[PDB]
Ligand binder design. Structure first.
Ligand SMILES: [Mg+2]
Length: 171
């Protein structure tokens, strides 16, 4: 079993000429150490969802697409506590008509919690949390509201390891 709720924060700076290129990719890694992990544990990379980010009074809408660098489960041997994970994110323009999941208000930067999450929990805990999360998004709720419930469900009796992303775009 593992039990800790761990997170890392990364920054994504959108290029000043994104209006031309209209695509950008970033890649992040992080080594987590959960000192509570005992026995053998399987850490599952949770399938991510695209995020629609709204900037400057939601006049600039961006689509963030996330892909795990290693899509395989992480296997921790007996009392092994540390593991490396990461993901790549691709930034593209969202349709003019897209619903914003995360809004910067009047500014050009947003903090996005839980863009990518791994869990040590069972398939039952993971699937319930993941499904409620996606239904929450489909029901039109904000990313932060949904992700907080999602991380909270995963963190109850298991380890949850989250990537947070700050996105900024200042052309
Ligand atoms: Mg730590």
């Amino acid at each position: 079993a593992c039990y800790s709720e761990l997170s890392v924060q990364h920054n994504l700076v959108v290029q000043g000429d994104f209006a031309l290129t209209q695509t950008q990719m970033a890649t992040y890694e992080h080594n987590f150490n959960d000192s509570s992990c005992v026995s053998t544990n399987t850490i599952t990379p949770m399938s991510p969802a695209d995020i629609i980010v709204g900037l400057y009074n939601d006049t600039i809408k961006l689509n963030l697409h996330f892909e795990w660098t290693n899509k395989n489960n992480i296997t921790l041997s007996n009392n092994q506590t540390s593991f490396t994970s990461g993901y790549s994110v691709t930034v593209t323009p969202a349709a003019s008509n897209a619903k914003v999941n995360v809004s910067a208000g009047g500014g050009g930067s947003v903090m996005i919690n839980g863009v990518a999450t791994l869990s040590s929990a069972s398939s039952s805990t993971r699937g319930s949390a993941a499904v409620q999360f996606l239904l929450c998004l489909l029901g039109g709720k904000s990313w932060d509201a949904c992700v907080n419930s999602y991380r909270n469900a995963l963190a109850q009796n298991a380890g949850v390891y989250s990537f947070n992303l700050t996105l900024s775009y200042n052309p």
